[PDB]
């Protein structure tokens with residue numbers, strides 16, 4: 070099996086001739102001890118690199134490049150798993166600095182490579198990094214046929230969020246939404262989870278089938294990070310009255326490409342999604358900042374201090390579902406805030 | 421003012437060197453009469469084109485280029501708002517056929533330009549067409565500061581989707597959703613709307629502030645299209661029992677780059693978003709496919725047969741708002757389907 074890695078990279082520090090040449094030197098040298106090949110390119114503070122060789126050798130090389138101080142946003146563009154005949158056998162790493170040389174046919178292609186990457190950097194921010202990992206794994210996400218997979222759906226939102234949008238100016242509101250979103254996304258990803266949607270102030274994420282505990286943990290930390298943010302903010306910041314509401318549900322969902330021909334997403338779709346959505350909806354009524362289904366509770370390895378709440382039902386297998394929260398110091402501090410939903414408005418009046 | 425335009429197009433039908441010569445010949449001569457300049461390129465069924473000249477003139481040229489049969493997936497990667505000096509003044513439309521020329525420098529450049537567009541085509545699918553429209557105007561989306569807009573928020577979902585998921589296979593479930601999403605996206609964009617989000621089987625979209633009347637019309641047109649779909653689908657097709665509920669709301673919104681730093685989107689936020697989303701849910705209870713807020717009714721020009729429905733609220737500001745619908749041949753046909761939605765599972769079992 071022969072691999073083919075292609076990627077883009079940004080210059081973290083403005084590199085000069087001596088530094089650029091040094092990168093080109095080591096590359097051709099080390100590749101000879103591993104038989105591996107490829108081509109290096111350069112333009113307006115951007116790197117372009119193709120690589121060919123053995124899967125175990127090639128994967129070790131890419132890992133090393135990710136540690137360099139002058140490298141930021143190392144995005145793999147294509148990864149061919151099985152290759153019969155290498156497209157670059159006569160070379161090792163023939164560096165091509167287009168920043169220096171200017172010809173006739175190259176001049177238009179130069180502008181092209183600048184605008185193409187520029188645009189590719191703009192899309193990168195608006196695309197779900199879940200698809201980028203798929204490309205890097207060596208698969209076209211559009212080619213993925215939908216599958217039946219059991220998962221834990223996470224659904225959260227900002228408590229009495231409408232009062233922020235009603236009182237505060239448009240700029241102040243979005244910074245608070247984004248703040249919350251960037252917090253919620255961070256904790257979930259690091260816990261091996263995936264944020265897949267947003268709607269107003271809603272966040273919708275998912276974790277593995279067995280990842281019940283990792284999900285419970287993620288919700289507790291979201292509350293935790295918000296507790297610090299409620300106090301540690303200065304007197305005259307809306308971030309003081311920021312509270313979350315979280316819902317979790319386990320079940321079999323359909324994950325794949327779901328949307329119009331124009332725009333789609335590699336997300337989940339199932340009954341569990343709505344089960345979570347509706348459970349979270351109940352956090353303001355149950356006065357518990359965290360709410361989850363009995364299936365989540367049973368799927369847990371750890372023996373958490375679970376609270377049982379007045380069971381309610383909707384769709385599914387027609388049968389009723391049991392609602393559970395967790396009795397913790399963090400939950401107690403956050404579950405009381407749902408009855409402070411009228412004391413938050415008093416604060417937002419002054420600002 | 422002067423304008424520069426860079427875009428990526430796809431080869432519709434297989435074209436040979438002789439047909440590519442014509443594209444170059446006709447363009448360059450028209451360019452000299454226009455005064456405008458540029459470069460055209462060829463690759464693995466991909467076009468690349470820079471175009472520089474007077475604003476109106478360039479637009480009138482791009483307009484014809486947007487109507488040529490040889491094209492597909494035409495996305496202008498960049499649009500330079502006000503240009504001071506052009507970058508190809510000595511050559512008007514100098515074509516470059518990379519399929520015919522094989523050189524030392526250009527061979528690895530070709531593979532790179534190909535993979536950059538290949539990966540760019542995939543990112544294009546997972547992105548809001550709004551950001552692509554934003555780019556074409558000139559400005560960058562990631563640099564748009566949030567603003568106070570007044571807009572009609574549309575919200576819709578598949579009626580008794582819960583039953584479709586359980587009975588039909590994964591491949592089949594997914595298609596029904598997408599099929600529904602295309603129907604909504606088509607008719608929404610046509611009437612001036614912008615589908616901003618998907619969430620499981622929900623569609624969030626928005627029409628402009630004064631375009632309330634058109635926003636109502638699209639909702640009617642969506643039901644109308646689904647009627648046709650149901651009436652004409654063969655035996656065994658789930659499209660026979662495919663119903664939709666629609667919730668509209670008018671009022672101020674906060675448009676902007678909402679999300680994390682790992683993933684963001686240019687969408688809506690505010691009061692209206694939630695109102696609209698709540699009214700769509702109420703359609704299942706109030707058994708009326710089309711449902712809208714009090715503000716939508718007051719902003720309507722044409723005299724529709726407005727049916728008043730049971731006034732209520734959830735969260736909001738504890739205040740109840742007048743909830744309406746329409747008494748039309750289509751509304752009355754689709755509204756009933758919500759009451760008989762309780763026994764649509766029988767047909768879905770039959771497959």
Ligand SMILES: Cc1cc2nc3c(=O)[nH]c(=O)nc-3n(C[C@H](O)[C@H](O)[C@H](O)COP(=O)(O)O)c2cc1C
Nearest residue numbers: 092095096097099100116118130133134137140162
């Ligand atoms: C753009 C770029 C390309 C590189 N290409 C290669 C390469 O082809 N082979 C290689 O072994 N290292 C390559 N490197 C990584 C260098 O070897 C690395 O900077 C460093 O010298 C590794 O430290 P070491 O000698 O302690 O392992 C590249 C680095 C950069 C910035």
Ligand SMILES: Cc1cc2nc3c(=O)[nH]c(=O)nc-3n(C[C@H](O)[C@H](O)[C@H](O)COP(=O)(O)O)c2cc1C
Nearest residue numbers: 443446447450451460467469481484485488490513
């Ligand atoms: C890839 C491509 C690029 C084109 N570029 C130009 C151009 O720069 N200028 C132009 O006038 N026509 C260009 N055309 C041709 C137009 O699509 C169209 O045929 C022309 O504007 C109308 O020509 P006519 O009035 O002689 O029929 C291009 C076509 C293709 C397929």
